[PDB]
Amino acid sequence: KVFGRCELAAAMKRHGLDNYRGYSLGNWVCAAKFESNFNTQATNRNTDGSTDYGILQINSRWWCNDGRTPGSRNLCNIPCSALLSSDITASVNCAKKIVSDGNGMNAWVAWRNRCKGTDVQAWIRGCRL
Amino acid sequence: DIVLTQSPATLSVTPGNSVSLSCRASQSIGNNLHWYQQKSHESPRLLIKYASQSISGIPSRFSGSGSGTDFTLSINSVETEDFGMYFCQQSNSWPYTFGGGTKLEIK
Amino acid sequence: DVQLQESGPSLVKPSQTLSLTCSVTGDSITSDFWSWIRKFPGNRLEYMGYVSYSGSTYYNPSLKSRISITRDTSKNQYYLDLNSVTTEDTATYYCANWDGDYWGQGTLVTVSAA
């Protein structure tokens, strides 16, 4: 599924990401935009053998288990396939654990490079929420 | 900190009847409210996560609803094994905080 | 399957440092975030803090920075240190994973001049 900007903003708000652990909603929409271009089925194989999965490109080496990644730790205790659904529930649940680490949203490289320091609120403006 | 207020403080019910427990947050916490059950001389047990999400291994009679500042835990047809304490906990902001708890006991 | 278990002294003196150990069996501590929660005499629960995978910690401000949560991978255990305790620290202490799926049995620690 490819979410519309406002469609995802509304969904993430329903999924409790507005002001979760100090991060305003715009951060999450912006992150999804640059991490997966709002595509819930997005996947990217990394050189270290790991793969990033879903709308928030969650990594198989530290967060989910896809059964094919070396030093997998499965910090989110969930199979990566669950992060490839049109339903964002699992991706949001795992993202919430990731951001609860001291590194916060810096775990998301695209967010760090294209969102951090920008007017992230712009990503939720012009939307019915 | 975010303050969670639970009510009623105590609720008596006859097995077979249904009940609903309330938990209100001092500020909006989205869906980041979880429910725990705790019996005498026992560690807490997670029943519902993120306001309404089910937990594997928990009886289906337990369900949660709500968002923002008002949440409820419902038990459809209370069983004797359900008597004990119920606490809500928010994970929206640090520090995580717990409600004062509601005691569920047989009439 | 995973199992958590608290251990340590059950009786401590005011002003001393209370130390508890949580032994994890079934998986490595490097595969989760670990927490400490305590229950006071009147059914009052307090989330003390947790240590995440990066080593970063989050402590409840209520503890006035008297708390330390550390880990030891070689022994697959994590710890709780609470400095300068008072009778207000008497409570049942529990270790549990961040997800709340695994909890230790809990251990009562009483702070008294005796």
Side-chain angles (χ1 to χ4, degrees):
Chain A
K1 173 182 177 62
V2 176
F3 275 85
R5 176 175 69 86
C6 290
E7 180 184 21
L8 184 58
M12 294 183 134
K13 180 180 176 58
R14 178 162 52 69
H15 281 265
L17 286 173
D18 196 343
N19 189 51
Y20 179 78
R21 293 303 291 278
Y23 284 101
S24 52
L25 189 63
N27 279 295
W28 300 102
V29 175
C30 184
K33 170 61 182 183
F34 295 103
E35 291 289 337
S36 70
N37 198 33
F38 302 140
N39 174 20
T40 63
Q41 311 302 301
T43 60
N44 181 61
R45 176 178 291 290
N46 305 301
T47 54
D48 72 325
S50 72
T51 299
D52 287 354
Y53 297 79
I55 191 158
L56 282 177
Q57 292 294 86
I58 297 175
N59 194 70
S60 66
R61 167 158 292 177
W62 308 84
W63 313 102
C64 62
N65 169 52
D66 61 2
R68 308 187 303 82
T69 314
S72 176
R73 295 185 181 182
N74 196 184
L75 287 166
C76 278
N77 311 305
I78 192 73
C80 301
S81 62
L83 308 183
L84 250 36
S85 170
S86 289
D87 184 337
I88 70 177
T89 301
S91 281
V92 171
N93 287 352
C94 181
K96 283 177 174 177
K97 185 166 190 176
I98 294 172
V99 78
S100 290
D101 173 74
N103 293 300
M105 287 192 81
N106 294 295
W108 286 283
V109 179
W111 170 86
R112 201 243 312 305
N113 291 164
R114 305 297 298 288
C115 303
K116 191 180 183 183
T118 73
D119 179 19
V120 292
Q121 184 86 303
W123 289 91
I124 62 176
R125 281 201 285 280
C127 294
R128 294 298 182 189
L129 305 175
Chain B
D1 310 330
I2 295 178
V3 176
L4 299 181
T5 302
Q6 281 180 262
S7 66
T10 301
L11 192 172
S12 303
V13 65
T14 302
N17 292 323
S18 298
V19 298
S20 290
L21 310 194
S22 171
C23 176
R24 289 170 30 273
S26 61
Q27 72 177 69
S28 181
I29 54 174
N31 72 335
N32 305 292
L33 191 279
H34 320 290
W35 291 92
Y36 282 91
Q37 179 190 73
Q38 175 166 46
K39 297 178 180 180
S40 183
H41 316 304
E42 213 172 69
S43 62
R45 183 187 301 289
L46 183 65
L47 303 171
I48 296 292
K49 69 178 182 186
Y50 291 113
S52 56
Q53 295 184 40
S54 297
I55 302 294
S56 182
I58 298 300
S60 301
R61 59 177 177 281
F62 288 100
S63 69
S65 65
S67 65
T69 60
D70 190 292
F71 305 78
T72 302
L73 171 70
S74 296
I75 308 177
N76 186 179
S77 191
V78 176
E79 300 292 352
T80 298
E81 70 177 316
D82 303 330
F83 296 124
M85 294 297 296
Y86 290 81
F87 299 96
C88 50
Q89 180 230 305
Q90 65 80 24
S91 66
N92 188 78
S93 310
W94 185 255
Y96 298 161
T97 50
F98 290 96
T102 289
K103 187 177 180 181
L104 185 69
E105 62 192 320
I106 184 173
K107 280 296 182 64
Chain C
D1 295 22
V2 179
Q3 306 179 184
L4 276 60
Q5 168 74 300
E6 303 86 1
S7 62
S10 62
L11 183 60
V12 295
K13 297 288 182 59
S15 297
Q16 84 164 76
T17 293
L18 168 58
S19 295
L20 251 36
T21 293
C22 183
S23 297
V24 180
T25 62
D27 212 316
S28 175
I29 50 180
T30 62
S31 292
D32 215 330
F33 292 14
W34 304 100
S35 314
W36 283 103
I37 295 90
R38 60 176 179 175
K39 183 181 184 180
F40 296 111
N43 284 164
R44 182 162 59 86
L45 291 168
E46 178 183 64
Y47 208 109
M48 299 181 82
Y50 69 88
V51 59
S52 54
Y53 90 115
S54 73
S56 58
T57 54
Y58 282 93
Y59 302 135
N60 191 322
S62 65
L63 304 175
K64 307 299 183 179
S65 204
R66 297 183 293 134
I67 178 176
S68 175
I69 292 174
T70 55
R71 303 171 300 172
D72 183 315
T73 302
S74 68
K75 288 190 286 293
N76 215 229
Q77 315 175 311
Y78 65 107
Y79 317 98
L80 168 69
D81 286 325
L82 187 60
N83 302 315
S84 303
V85 298
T86 70
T87 56
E88 297 288 354
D89 291 303
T90 293
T92 298
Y93 293 70
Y94 313 81
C95 52
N97 72 149
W98 186 87
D99 296 298
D101 294 308
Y102 314 122
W103 290 71
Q105 68 178 309
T107 188
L108 175 70
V109 177
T110 303
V111 187
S112 59

